[PDB]
Amino acid sequence: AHAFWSTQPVPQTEDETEKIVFAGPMDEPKTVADIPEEPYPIASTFEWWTPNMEAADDIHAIYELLRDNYVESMFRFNYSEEFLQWALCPPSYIPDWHVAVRRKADKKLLAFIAGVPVTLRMGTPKYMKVKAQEKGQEEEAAKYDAPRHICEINFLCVHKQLREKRLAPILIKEVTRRVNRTNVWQAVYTAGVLLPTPYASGQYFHRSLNPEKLVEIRFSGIPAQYQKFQNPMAMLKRNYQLPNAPKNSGLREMKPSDVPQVRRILMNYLDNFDVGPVFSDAEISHYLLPRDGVVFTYVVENDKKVTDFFSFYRIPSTVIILNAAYVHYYAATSMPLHQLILDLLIVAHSRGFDVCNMVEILDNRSFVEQLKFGAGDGHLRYYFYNWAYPKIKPSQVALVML
Ligand SMILES: CCCCCCCCCCCCCC(=O)CSCCNC(=O)CCNC(=O)[C@H](O)C(C)(C)COP(=O)(O)OP(=O)(O)OC[C@H]1O[C@@H](n2cnc3c(N)ncnc32)[C@H](O)[C@@H]1OP(=O)(O)O
Known part of the structure; x- marks a missing residue:
């Protein structure tokens, strides 16, 4: 089962993606006013935190979380504070798309996910446009050809002490809400594991x-x-x-x-x-x-x-x-x-x-x-x-x- 991903606007089976003709949204459209400004609920021991990337202590905290709790026996990747700066803070980055969870009692950083803006060409692929032309559906196929200003997600990380608690779904819901408050409704992301459902591997x-x-x-x-x-x-x-x-x-x-x-x-x-x-x-x-x-x-x-x-x-x-x-x-x-x-x-x-x-x-x-x-x-x-x-x-x- 996928208790979280089954609930989300992503294709649910590989078969679903082999039968998608045209690029476009999955959810029917929503407005910014439909999205709440109150952050998604999390347990009382925790608080949401938006790190300031201009503050050395905040970037340090992020560095330390990822150093010990990011993607895995004889070698350990090291994503430096400079690397993280670079990856997380491109031009016109949106500060609150950097989403953290801290423990209130001692301010320990325990989870993180980041979105950054990207402008992506993501209209109907070439081979699908040929099939559309054959059916007189060129218009439907070309609707979304203009490059789109979306969110690219990376650096999802839950501290090892908080694993298997369904905190990753809460981080994903919260960053989704913050992205949707800016009137952005798509994201792109990658993973080394199989989730529902990749468009390429x-x-x-x-x-x-x-x-x-x-x-x-x-x-x-x-x-x-x-x-x-x-x-x-x-x-x-x-x-x-x-x-x-x-x-x-x-x-x-x-x-x-x-x-x-x-x-x-x-x-x-x-x-x-x-x-x-x-x-x-x-x-x-x-x-x-x-x-x-x-x-x-x-x-x-x-x-x-x-x-x-x-x-x-x-x-x-x-x-x-x-x-x-x-x-x-x-x-x-x-x-x-x-x-x-x-x-x-x-x-x-x-x-x-x-x-x-x-x-x-x-x-x-x-x-x-x-x-x-x-x-x-x-x-x-x-x-x-x-x-x-x-x-x-x-x-x-x-x-x-x-
Ligand atoms: C419009 C804007 C939209 C913005 C948002 C777009 C979507 C962005 C999506 C995120 C893209 C990030 C891409 C990116 O950062 C690049 S891939 C690198 C991801 N990070 C790591 O592997 C770090 C080490 N692992 C951990 O920190 C934890 O194990 C994580 C946090 C991975 C899961 O924490 P946990 O404590 O072990 O697990 P629960 O909290 O109990 O949650 C279990 C649920 O998490 C689903 N899961 C596991 N790994 C995932 C992964 N790599 N993507 C998406 N989902 C993943 C899993 O299938 C399950 O759902 P299900 O029950 O339905 O199967």
Whole structure:
């Protein structure tokens, strides 16, 4: 059973999503006045709290909750206060979409969920519009084509002492109410677990950058078939060896003056996909300008024209440090994508990253074999709240989730 999700405006079965023709809302429309301003009830020992992200103590409290109680044996992800700043506070973020529960008696932070604004293209997917054209339903299929200003949810976390108490449903209801008070009625979110009901699912992939280190810290092993070689580690270092420097002329760190051209080339690329974000210059600046410890972004520029760029973000892990790079956004116009991403690998390796990770969204499959990525055990599932949407392949998703 799904005692909570069965009550919510999401598709209830996979079959439901294989039969959805057009994008659009699931609930009939409501007004802001229909939504109460009183927060959702919670037990007397607890209080709702809206953290101030301009206050070092508040961001510290969030950091400590997630440090000990977020997604899980030899490694522990570390989401720094700077990383959390970055992820939670994009341009025009809404402070009360950062929703916390604290214990009244001692003010201990015990649960959290965050929404941030995103503008998303989420109209009827290409293959569904062809079926609609065939039936004279082009209009119904195109109704929701305009990019929509919605909520992206992340960092749901209930302290271990409060697990299995149905507090996550109360956090979800409360953030839903706060989003609906701003006249927003859809959200996008992801999870590594299967809930009702994803519109897309992609496997994770990894590429070792420093296999000697990975093996020493027991993050990677030496696979069975290398064990047959005379020198298994030299063969492993060989498989994954990278140049010391890239060979593409004009590759450099992205600067503020590159923002407008990066925005243009990224938006031209992301328009190719069924679901994807639309970013203003301020959002390009926020999400892509280099930020020590967090985001790394490079452009290929010559003659004052930016023709390509790539970005990756960092999530380090405590070894019970593993320095992981995650492919972020990119756009190639002057070179094959695999060469742009080779340059990403070379730069990440040079900066001391140990592994590069991605999910098979965007065109990430296109360079897997040649760049020595391997499939991993996880899948990232994409979901909408209050949005009927056909199943799509992960290569039609262009939204990277931090
Ligand atoms: C219009 C605006 C709309 C805005 C809102 C949109 C929707 C946003 C939705 C949220 C998106 C967040 C995405 C995101 O953050 C990225 S996925 C990362 C989620 N966080 C973690 O895994 C952290 C570690 N785990 C915990 O903190 C707890 O185990 C959590 C909090 C996960 C569950 O706490 P608990 O104490 O273990 O469990 P109960 O309180 O007793 O609740 C059990 C109910 O929770 C459902 N559950 C479990 N995991 C979930 C997950 N990852 N998403 C959604 N639902 C999840 C579960 O199916 C069950 O419902 P059911 O009985 O019907 O099956």
